[PDB]
Amino acid sequence: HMQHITVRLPKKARAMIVGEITNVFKDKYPIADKLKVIPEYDVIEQDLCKLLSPGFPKQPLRVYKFGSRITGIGNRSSDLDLFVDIGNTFHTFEHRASNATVAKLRAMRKFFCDSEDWRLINFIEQARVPIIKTCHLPTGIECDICLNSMGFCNTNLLKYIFESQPLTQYMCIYVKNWLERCKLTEQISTYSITLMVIYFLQLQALLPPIAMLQIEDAANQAVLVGPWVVNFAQKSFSELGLQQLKATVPVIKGFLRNFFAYFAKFDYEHFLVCPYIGQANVEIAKIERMLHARYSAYVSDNPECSIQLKKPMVVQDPIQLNHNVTKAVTKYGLQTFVDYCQQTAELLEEP
């Protein structure tokens, strides 16, 4: 659509970008760090167990917290994501929820509804990942409750990445806020652009390929959720041979300029963002042959569950390798993102 005219960067974004990088982080980073762990979360998880256990007597029940609060890029308005594991379902993968999973979520709904400690906000059973959205009234924190473990698994990977290489965390706080000010979150999520930051830094030799953390040998076995390897070697970057930078304003600004310039000129027709492989120029035409043998076997028995590559923008989840997290980005949404990237890189320059 008017592909010959650049989509103008929104003024709400422009003001943030041309304003000092300091003001971006002065409050936001300390807040995000603090929100990795606060006692409110223990209250939420204790209340969730007490609420739901009677509904599932004799089954084990464990609560796993995840999402932006837990990884260190949240703010006070952020939700908290919770995987409720009833009956040791952690290692079970369902690309689309099973009838059994849906029946469980439907049963859980009335508990939040009847309970005075919880306000039911929405019940979403048609999504790829069905969720219950509910406010925990004693803390006021909005919670997304799901029934599979993949988000928790990628949260733990992000936490390792952010703690090892804090530049990654600063960059993700910045680009999260940039997406919001650009009004792009309908199309590109915080998690998607987090994977884009990770991939970009892998290309700079500042983060390992995820595949390199998941070598399967005598010393290292996989934790499998269905066909997906969800654990990783928690090696020091010293051992990996990767330098660990101190995030300063000038360091952050230079890496952000290069991030936006890179994705402004990325060839989305032929290549995908691929933190699994962590190397430059990963071809859409080749990725499905570059994955572990479990992927090929999984698609054989689930032929409609292969990664969706016939899409404008391909960003592959590094653990759930059949998931293009940007599969809903349209041609015009991608043009908009590219144009906003181009204009942001321009405003971060300083000859």
Numbering used by the authors: 200 to 550
What sentences appear in the manuscript?
Through this unique feature, Tailor plays a crucial role as the repressor in the biogenesis pathway of splicing-derived mirtron pre-miRNAs. The structure of Tailor contains two canonical globular domains separated by a large catalytic groove, which serves to accommodate the 3′ ends of the target RNAs for the post-transcriptional addition of uridyl ribonucleotides.
Three complex structures of Tailor-AGU, Tailor-AGUU and Tailor-U4 (Tailor-UUUU) we obtained in this research were respectively designed to mimic the post-catalytic states of the addition of the first and second uridines as well as the extension of polyuridylation chain. As indicated by the structural analysis, the terminal Us in both Tailor-AGU and Tailor-AGUU adopt a very similar conformation at the +1 position (U+1) as their equivalent nucleotides in previously reported structures, interacting with the surrounding residues through extensive direct and water-mediated hydrogen bonds, as well as hydrophobic interactions. More specifically, the O2 carbonyl group and 2′-hydroxyl group of U+1 make two direct hydrogen bonds with the side-chain group of N353. Furthermore, the side-chain of T354 contributes to the generation of water-mediated hydrogen bonds with 2′- and 3′-hydroxyl groups of U+1, while U+1 base forms hydrophobic stacking interaction against the aromatic side-chain of Y390 and an additional hydrophobic interaction with the main chain of V542, as well as a water-mediated hydrogen-bonding network with D515, Q519, and H522 from NRM loop. At the 0 nucleotide-binding position which is occupied by a guanine (G0) and a uridine (U0) in two complexes, respectively, protein-RNA recognition modes are similar but not identical. In Tailor-AGU, the O6 carbonyl group and N7 imino proton of G0 form totally three hydrogen bonds with the guanidine groups of R327 from the loop connecting β3 and β4 strands while the NH2 group of G0 is involved in a hydrogen bond with the side-chain group of N347, ensuring this guanine is specifically recognized by Tailor. Other than these direct recognitions, G0 base also makes water-mediated hydrogen bonding interactions with the side-chain groups of N347 and Q519, and a hydrophobic interaction with the side-chain group of V328. 5′A at the -1 position (A-1) in Tailor-AGU is less restricted by the interactions with the protein except the hydrophobic interactions with I323 and I330 and a water-mediated hydrogen bond between 2′-hydroxyl group and main chain atom of V328. R327 and N347 are key residues in forming direct hydrogen bonds with G0.
